[PDB]
Curated annotation (Swiss-Prot), chain B:
Keywords: Chromatin regulator, Metal-binding, Nucleus, Phosphoprotein, Transcription, Transcription regulation, Zinc, Zinc-finger. The chain holds residues 9 to 141 of 252 of the full protein. The gene is AL7. GO terms for molecular function: methylated histone binding; transcription cis-regulatory region binding; zinc ion binding. One of its GO terms (cellular component) is nucleus. Interacts with H3K4me3 and to a lesser extent with H3K4me2. The PHD-type zinc finger mediates the binding to H3K4me3. This is PHD finger protein ALFIN-LIKE 7. It is found in: Nucleus. Ubiquitously expressed. Histone-binding component that specifically recognizes H3 tails trimethylated on 'Lys-4' (H3K4me3), which mark transcription start sites of virtually all active genes. One of its GO terms (biological process) is chromatin organization. Belongs to the Alfin family. It comes from the Eukaryota.
Length: 133, 134
């Protein structure tokens, strides 16, 4: 069903916004992550934008939430290692969101397999930011 | 695959079994712990096949992905089996997040991620289990 492509399009859009935050806009992202601020995250939207403040959602929130408090360790390691750690959390979030949508759209086992194959043909954000893409 | 792939899958299967317990065998205990008079609660699965309903807190640093919060707010607004299904789908998305997070911390590459997904997707989702979709 063309619904696998719609869910994958959403995933690619959020992934593009997160890759922007962690590469092209890395210093903007870094400076918004002062380590004494509370509850910051990296949130990706399918229009290829990003934000560090958790958006207000319904209750329960419809989408899985990304990691909060990612800014505490910003100064405790090399910037590229902190970026890599944000990348790993971000990759685990994106796959959560995509499979949540797949379930909401009534994907069965075959649709779940097709969605994963498309996701896993792209380098992870971790691989992008570490130079292993 | 390296041994770590099966070890990450074993963690996944054990948490899944705990979540299946909460949403089936232990459903009334789970239901009553999802008290609508408490603050927003989450359902967690642990690798020893147990489950817990806890208020999420601001863990610093963040560790595992966080499950859906506020499941207790929706409990009385739906037929119980539809609320169970809602919790199940959120729990399925949490489990795959946890598994791929561990896989990343343990340096999985493309092939290791494929093998891990293959094993996860052999099993019916918790949503399928609780709705009779196998």
């Amino acid at each position: 069903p063309r619904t696998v492509e719609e869910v994958f399009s959403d995933f690619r859009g959020r992934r593009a916004g997160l890759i922007k935050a962690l590469s092209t806009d890395v210093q903007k992202f870094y400076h918004q992550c002062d380590p004494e601020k509370e509850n910051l995250c990296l949130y990706g939207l399918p229009n290829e934008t990003w934000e560090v403040n958790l958006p207000v959602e319904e209750v329960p929130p419809e989408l899985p939430e990304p990691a909060l408090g990612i800014n505490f360790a910003r100064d405790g390691m090399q910037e590229k290692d902190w970026i890599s750690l944000v990348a790993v959390h971000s990759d685990s979030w994106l796959i959560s969101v995509a499979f949540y949508f797949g379930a909401r759209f009534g994907f069965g086992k075959n649709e779940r397999k097709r969605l994963f194959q498309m996701i896993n043909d792209l380098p992870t954000i971790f691989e992008v930011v570490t130079g292993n893409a």
